[PDB]
Design a protein around this motif. Structure first.
Motif, PDB file in Angstrom:
ATOM      1  N   UNK A 122       0.772  -1.233   0.000  1.00 13.86           N
ATOM      2  CA  UNK A 122       0.000   0.000   0.000  1.00 13.86           C
ATOM      3  C   UNK A 122       0.809   1.293   0.000  1.00 13.86           C
ATOM      4  N   UNK A 123       0.196   2.350  -0.530  1.00 15.61           N
ATOM      5  CA  UNK A 123       0.825   3.670  -0.542  1.00 15.61           C
ATOM      6  C   UNK A 123       0.741   4.200   0.894  1.00 15.61           C
ATOM      7  N   UNK A 124      -0.423   3.997   1.512  1.00 12.28           N
ATOM      8  CA  UNK A 124      -0.700   4.413   2.887  1.00 12.28           C
ATOM      9  C   UNK A 124      -1.894   3.589   3.394  1.00 12.28           C
ATOM     10  N   UNK A 125      -2.295   3.777   4.650  1.00 13.43           N
ATOM     11  CA  UNK A 125      -3.405   2.989   5.180  1.00 13.43           C
ATOM     12  C   UNK A 125      -4.829   3.438   4.841  1.00 13.43           C
ATOM     13  N   UNK A 126      -4.962   4.501   4.051  1.00  8.52           N
ATOM     14  CA  UNK A 126      -6.281   4.978   3.623  1.00  8.52           C
ATOM     15  C   UNK A 126      -6.086   5.792   2.347  1.00  8.52           C
ATOM     16  N   UNK A 127      -5.770   5.108   1.238  1.00  4.75           N
ATOM     17  CA  UNK A 127      -5.541   5.758  -0.055  1.00  4.75           C
ATOM     18  C   UNK A 127      -6.659   6.662  -0.544  1.00  4.75           C
ATOM     19  N   UNK A 128      -7.901   6.223  -0.374  1.00  8.25           N
ATOM     20  CA  UNK A 128      -9.043   6.994  -0.845  1.00  8.25           C
ATOM     21  C   UNK A 128      -9.322   8.295  -0.093  1.00  8.25           C
ATOM     22  N   UNK A 129      -8.866   8.391   1.153  1.00  2.94           N
ATOM     23  CA  UNK A 129      -9.117   9.588   1.952  1.00  2.94           C
ATOM     24  C   UNK A 129      -7.893  10.036   2.751  1.00  2.94           C
ATOM     25  N   UNK A 130      -7.181  11.068   2.260  1.00  3.57           N
ATOM     26  CA  UNK A 130      -5.981  11.615   2.911  1.00  3.57           C
ATOM     27  C   UNK A 130      -6.248  12.092   4.336  1.00  3.57           C
ATOM     28  N   UNK A 131      -7.450  12.609   4.579  1.00  5.18           N
ATOM     29  CA  UNK A 131      -7.807  13.106   5.904  1.00  5.18           C
ATOM     30  C   UNK A 131      -7.889  12.001   6.954  1.00  5.18           C
ATOM     31  N   UNK A 132      -8.039  10.755   6.507  1.00  3.15           N
ATOM     32  CA  UNK A 132      -8.140   9.623   7.426  1.00  3.15           C
ATOM     33  C   UNK A 132      -6.883   8.756   7.512  1.00  3.15           C
ATOM     34  N   UNK A 133      -5.816   9.170   6.835  1.00  2.00           N
ATOM     35  CA  UNK A 133      -4.571   8.409   6.847  1.00  2.00           C
ATOM     36  C   UNK A 133      -3.872   8.498   8.205  1.00  2.00           C
ATOM     37  N   UNK A 134      -3.411   7.354   8.704  1.00 10.83           N
ATOM     38  CA  UNK A 134      -2.704   7.287   9.980  1.00 10.83           C
ATOM     39  C   UNK A 134      -1.304   6.713   9.794  1.00 10.83           C
ATOM     40  N   UNK A 135      -1.056   6.145   8.617  1.00 13.21           N
ATOM     41  CA  UNK A 135       0.238   5.553   8.304  1.00 13.21           C
ATOM     42  C   UNK A 135       0.618   5.840   6.855  1.00 13.21           C
TER      43      UNK A 135
END
Length: 187
Positions: free
Chosen positions: A133-146
């Motif tokens: 994964x790119x990050x733990x919430x690809x679809x929503x940057x505001x919800x990314x924690x990792x």
């Protein structure tokens, strides 16, 4: 066992593909210390929500990490992923790095890729060091924690091993052409 993911330390699988904006690129032609191969597309909300970060990482790491985007989606069924659309998507999001079309879907198959966005990060010896994964919430940057990809890159720049716990790709499934669907078997 069928279609197992590419294991860590596996050598870079070369490919030469066209960029709809013009020219052709070979994966082995990039000589930066690190290489990030990202299977993506235009339609996927996971790509749409993480492309800003992907481009920002590419900008921050110019000369250190070479980025390459690959769209292998069936654009007849998914018109938003058509070559012309790729060029427009690249312009819209400032994708300055190569964004390649995998018409036959053979590159996606060789990498045993399954989703968009799915990243394969290679080191100086062009061996796979991070996959997922790119990050733990690809679809929503505001919800990314990792920010998994950023963390992996930073670890490699410091000569450290990226996080031991695997973080598989999060996103839309790759849109396989009729008959190209990978028959995944765990054993």
């Amino acid at each position: 066992l069928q279609y197992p993911e590419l294991p860590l330390e596996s050598p870079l699988i070369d490919a030469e593909l066209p960029d709809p904006r013009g020219g052709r690129y070979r994966l082995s032609q990039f000589h930066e210390p690190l290489l990030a191969v990202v299977f993506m597309c235009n339609h996927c909300p996971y790509v749409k929500g993480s492309i800003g970060e992907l481009v920002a990482l590419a900008e921050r790491y110019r000369g250190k990490v070479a980025f390459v985007g690959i769209n292998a989606n069936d654009y007849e069924k998914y018109p938003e992923d058509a070559p012309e659309k790729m060029a427009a998507f690249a312009e819209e999001h400032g994708i300055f790095f190569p964004y390649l079309l995998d018409e036959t879907q053979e590159v996606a198959k060789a990498y045993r890729a399954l989703r968009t966005p799915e990243v394969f990060l290679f080191d100086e010896r062009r061996l796979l060091r991070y996959h997922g994964r790119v990050n733990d919430n690809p679809k929503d940057p505001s919800k990314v924690q990792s920010h998994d990809l950023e963390a992996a890159i930073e670890a490699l720049l410091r000569g450290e091993e990226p996080p031991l716990k695997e973080a598989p790709a999060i996103g839309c499934t790759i849109k396989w052409r009729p008959g190209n669907e990978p028959e995944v078997r765990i054993g």
